[PDB]
Design a protein around this ligand. Structure first.
Ligand SMILES: Nc1ncnc2c1ncn2[C@@H]1O[C@H](COP(=O)(O)OP(=O)(O)OP(O)(O)=S)[C@@H](O)[C@H]1O
Ligand SMILES: Nc1ncnc2c1ncn2[C@@H]1O[C@H](COP(=O)(O)OP(=O)(O)OP(O)(O)=S)[C@@H](O)[C@H]1O
Lengths: 52, 106, 373, 425
């Protein structure tokens, strides 16, 4: 449930390759799929351990 | 092909010379080699120091275990069953094996 | 522009004036003064005596005075073998170079009765050899004994780094015996005798060496902790290639390599905010000042992260990689220390080069480590 | 030299050069440099002066392994053959005994073989007598420092002779090495050049990959559809997604900055797509291809993730019975190191504190006898020496040596929380 969402981030990282800290246009492709705002909020903090 | 049994004991603290030469033979030699470390110390990678681990191609493979009760039951069936025809007893012998094995109360 | 600075990198000293007084009987063929020449290290002192004897041998009468380097012996025999090498002869060598009394037979010359003085180079390898009062002090004792009756005496000139060696002498030897007394020292030349030799070592002078007051500035602000100004010109010879590479500028380049991460570039090492969290996690485990394993750190890492839920608890394998990010910058070092249960078994104890004063500044800017402190 | 003629054999039966085979040929770690470009000059201009002026100097470089210091100094001397010297690779770790390097030097001046004693006599006799040119690489200097520093004093005292035709180049592990192992008397002779090598940066880590991917990135292969053999029936191409190459760079530059680690994680991720391509079509061993981002996601994680958690849940029952008893004592006493008899005391007690549940009884029947009501009344449990030996050589446990099999202490070797955590499954 979290292996896919790294690759849509990689689709953004394909586009501009930006590691921004706070988001307004990363979250815009998530709400149309089916997951809430809280699941991605954890995905911000846990992928900080990946240093990405 | 290199076959190394108990490569952890070569990975001592003091010198580690012999590991350092074969792992650099990966990097430079035109002679195609392959190294096969076999051990049982699990965290083998922390036992190495820095300059040897950077020579190492980092790929380890863990060996499986019998994870379910059914697995070794399947193993002993393949273990004891003869498939080639040698004896007249064989066809009688093969069905006696599984009949003990199929019954969970046997 | 190369050949002027190609030649840049290569009687003369005001210490040679001392030793001719100390060798006042060496031109009258008598036994000279009593020579134990010491020095703080790097002070030119190895080549200092080598400057004297090479000026002695090129000046000087039958001429045979030899000098050998005591490095690879650990044992007092083959020194007395190497004095035989100036003879180019053949004999029974082993017994004559071994015992104290065996050296005495060796001191009867052959051709014209010119006295011999030996030079013992780098005596501190035998001083700081095997245990003192057993072999090495006895070796020191046996060499300095010059009670021979003719004036043909094996005058020692030995050299040492650290100045404890005189108090190491026995009270009989300190009763004005042998080559003892003249403990000629060499204080490290600040700029007042060494720089002027560099001036005369600029006999072939290019036009733009540089502003020599900056060279004087180089000498004054290197003389805090130094002994070798040609080698500290060999750091000018590297910066003189910097002005060739770009077609005390370099001491400024080299100290910022060493001073930084504690003041500024600590946060450079921890761009990850979790790397900031794991760095405080190490210091919280340092309360139990023990063999700080990667597991006991992982113990305090889990039991705090279950209380304050700043992040999810990560893997031990992740905990292995993240502390190595702390390692390669040079903050924390890891060593395989001692635990002696079954064999010499190696658990990994860490050590941090940061203080809580240089910690508390960089954490009050981030209130997410403030639950953890 | 000699036997490479004998290392050749004849019958080479047409090995299949697939798509990803030609990658790994150039992804071999062998074959101007972008990252340490100017510092190559800083060595060389330090070296070019002494070479063409017949002097004796010292050059000291440091850094973590994987930064090119094995590589760069080889590129220094390589061009110098075009323009008087004898090149030797005096490796520290390739010497069996530390004195054995002395034999090499006296071998590499005339061709003679004596002891390390007799070499350094004639070496010293060389270095102060010869009228007037030797390049020597003193690699991996942690090896040759260990005993009593008497070797290391020699290798810099030879530099002090103005009549010594030698150029030394030291490459260490750390800059600290003449300040925490050597004496100050060596530290005067080491000089103060001290050329530091940092890590690589992640931008340059992209710039080192494509140097191996020069003529092959997004190029075309000629392929027969029957055997999977590729030639530099279809004419296929293979592309490398640069963003996945970038995320390889942003990790390896972050943790280590190691040039072997960057190449090899690309090399490991290359063969993951190799087997998946062979899985779908099966060309064996006798429209547009690519490498996804999902390959380097796995292979970089494949450097990290363990199995001792998966090993513990796939162990025996009495193994998991053992550790659960062992954490029970560590939370009973808080002493992290329990006597072996108390564990055998506990596994007895951990039977009957649970109820008369027939699963525990079918355990407790089997735990003290393998059925067979004839032979029974075992004191310690079945195979208790076996699982304790199995937990010992696995590295999970650790047990100090004592002939008493009761008061010999046991210490854990992995983190006890993950032992608590894996027990929950
Ligand atoms: N006053 C000087 N006159 C001439 N040459 C000098 C002078 N001071 C230093 N040098 C040269 O610079 C070198 C620096 O000295 P070092 O050899 O490094 O120290 P040292 O000569 O070993 O004395 P130590 O350290 O006490 S054994 C000398 O060996 C000489 O080659
Ligand atoms: N800048 C570069 N350009 C091209 N290839 C490189 C570069 N840096 C490293 N490599 C390659 O990566 C390998 C890494 O070896 P080195 O970094 O030279 O060894 P190292 O840095 O001394 O580590 P050691 O030898 O264990 S101390 C080299 O042998 C080259 O094949």
């Amino acid at each position: 449930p979290t292996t896919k969402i790294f690759t849509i981030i990689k689709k953004m990282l394909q586009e501009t390759g930006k590691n921004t800290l706070s988001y307004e246009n990363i979250v815009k492709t998530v709400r149309l799929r089916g997951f809430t705002m809280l699941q991605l909020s954890n995905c911000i903090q846990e992928y900080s351990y990946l240093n990405v | 092909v290199f076959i190394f049994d108990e490569i952890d004991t070569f990975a001592g603290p003091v010198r580690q010379t012999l590991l350092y030469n074969l792992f650099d033979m990966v990097e430079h030699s035109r002679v195609p080699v392959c190294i096969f470390g076999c051990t049982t110390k699990l965290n083998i990678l922390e036992y190495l120091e820095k300059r040897v681990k950077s020579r190492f191609s980092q790929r380890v493979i863990y060996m499986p275990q019998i994870q379910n009760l059914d697995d070794m039951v399947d193993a002993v069936r393949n273990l004891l069953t003869v498939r080639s025809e040698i004896s007249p007893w064989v066809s009688q012998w093969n069905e006696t094996l599984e009949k003990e094995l199929s019954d969970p109360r046997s | 522009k190369a050949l002027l600075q190609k030649s840049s990198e290569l009687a003369r000293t005001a210490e040679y004036e001392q030793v001719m007084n100390f060798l006042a009987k060496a031109i009258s063929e008598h036994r000279s003064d009593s020579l134990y020449i010491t020095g703080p290290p790097g002070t030119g002192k190895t080549a200092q005596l080598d400057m004297i004897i090479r000026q002695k041998f090129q000046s000087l009468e039958s001429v045979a005075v030899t000098s050998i380097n005591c490095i690879s012996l650990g044992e007092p025999s083959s020194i007395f073998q190497k004095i035989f090498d100036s003879f180019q002869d053949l004999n029974g060598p082993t017994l004559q170079i071994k015992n104290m009394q065996h050296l005495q037979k060796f001191l009867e010359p052959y051709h014209k009765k010119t006295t011999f003085v030996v030079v013992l180079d780098e005596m501190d390898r035998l001083l700081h050899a095997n245990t003192s009062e057993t072999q090495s002090v006895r070796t020191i004792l046996e060499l300095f004994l010059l009670a021979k009756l003719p004036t043909v005496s094996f005058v020692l000139i030995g050299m040492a780094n650290s100045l404890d060696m005189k108090d190491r002498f026995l009270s009989r030897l300190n009763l004005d015996r042998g080559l003892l007394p003249q403990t000629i020292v060499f204080q490290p030349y600040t700029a007042e005798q060494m720089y002027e030799i560099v001036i005369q070592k600029m006999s072939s002078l290019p036009t733009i060496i540089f502003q020599p007051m900056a060279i004087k500035f180089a000498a004054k602000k290197c003389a805090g902790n130094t002994g070798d100004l040609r080698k500290l010109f060999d750091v000018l010879r590297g910066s003189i290639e910097i002005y060739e590479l770009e077609k005390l500028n370099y001491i400024a380049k080299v100290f910022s390599k060493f001073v930084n991460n504690n003041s500024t570039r600590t946060r450079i090492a921890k761009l990850n905010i979790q790397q900031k969290l794991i760095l405080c996690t190490i210091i919280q485990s340092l309360k139990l000042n023990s063999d700080a394993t990667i597991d006991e750190s992982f113990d305090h890492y889990i039991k705090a992260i279950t209380k304050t839920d700043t992040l999810a608890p990560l893997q031990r394998n992740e905990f292995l990689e993240i502390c190595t990010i702390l390692e390669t910058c040079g903050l924390v070092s890891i060593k395989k220390t001692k635990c002696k249960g079954k064999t010499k078994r190696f658990v990994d104890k860490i050590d941090v080069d940061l203080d809580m004063r240089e910690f508390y500044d960089e954490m009050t800017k981030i209130s997410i480590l403030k639950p953890f402190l | 030299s000699r036997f490479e003629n004998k290392l050749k054999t004849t019958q080479k039966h047409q090995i299949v050069e697939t798509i990803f085979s030609k990658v790994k040929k150039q992804l071999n770690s062998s074959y101007y440099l972008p990252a340490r470009e100017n510092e190559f000059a800083s060595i060389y201009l330090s070296a070019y002066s002494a070479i063409e002026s017949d002097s004796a100097t010292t050059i000291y470089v440091a850094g973590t392994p994987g930064v090119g210091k094995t590589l760069t100094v080889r590129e220094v001397v390589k061009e110098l053959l075009s323009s008087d010297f004898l090149y030797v690779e005096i490796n520290g770790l390739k010497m069996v005994k530390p004195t054995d390097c002395y034999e090499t030097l006296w071998n590499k001046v005339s061709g003679e073989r004596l002891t390390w004693a007799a070499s350094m006599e004639s070496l010293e006799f060389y270095f102060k007598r010869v009228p007037k040119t030797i390049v020597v690489l003193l690699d991996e200097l942690d090896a040759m420092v260990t005993k009593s520093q008497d070797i290391m004093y020699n290798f810099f005292n030879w530099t002090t002779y103005e009549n010594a035709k030698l150029i030394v180049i030291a490459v260490a592990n750390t800059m600290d090495l003449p300040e925490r192992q050597l004496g100050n008397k060596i530290t005067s002779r080491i000089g103060f050049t001290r050329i530091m090598f940092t890590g690589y940066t992640h931008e340059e880590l992209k710039n080192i990959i494509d140097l191996r991917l020069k003529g092959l990135n997004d190029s075309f292969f000629y392929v027969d559809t029957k055997t999977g053999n590729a030639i530099l029936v279809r004419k296929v191409r293979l592309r490398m997604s640069a963003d996945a190459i970038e995320i390889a760079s942003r990790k390896v530059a972050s943790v280590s900055g190691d040039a072997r680690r960057a190449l090899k994680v690309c090399k490991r991720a290359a063969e993951i797509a190799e087997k998946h391509y062979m899985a779908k079509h099966g060309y064996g061993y006798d429209g547009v291809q690519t490498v996804h981002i999902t390959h380097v996601m796995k292979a970089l994680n494949e450097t990290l993730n363990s199995h001792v958690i998966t090993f513990m849940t796939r162990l025996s029952f009495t193994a998991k019975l053992f550790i659960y008893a062992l954490l029970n004592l560590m939370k009973k006493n808080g002493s992290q190191e329990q006597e072996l008899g108390d564990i055998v005391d506990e596994i007895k007690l951990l039977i009957e504190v649970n109820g008369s549940n027939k699963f525990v009884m079918e355990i407790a029947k089997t735990l003290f006898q393998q059925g067979s009501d004839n032979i029974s009344e075992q004191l310690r449990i079945i195979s208790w020496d076996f699982v304790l030996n199995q937990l010992l050589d696995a590295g999970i446990l650790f047990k100090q040596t004592m002939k008493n099999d009761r008061i010999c202490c046991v210490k854990l070797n992995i983190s006890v929380e993950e032992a608590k955590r894996a027990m929950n499954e």
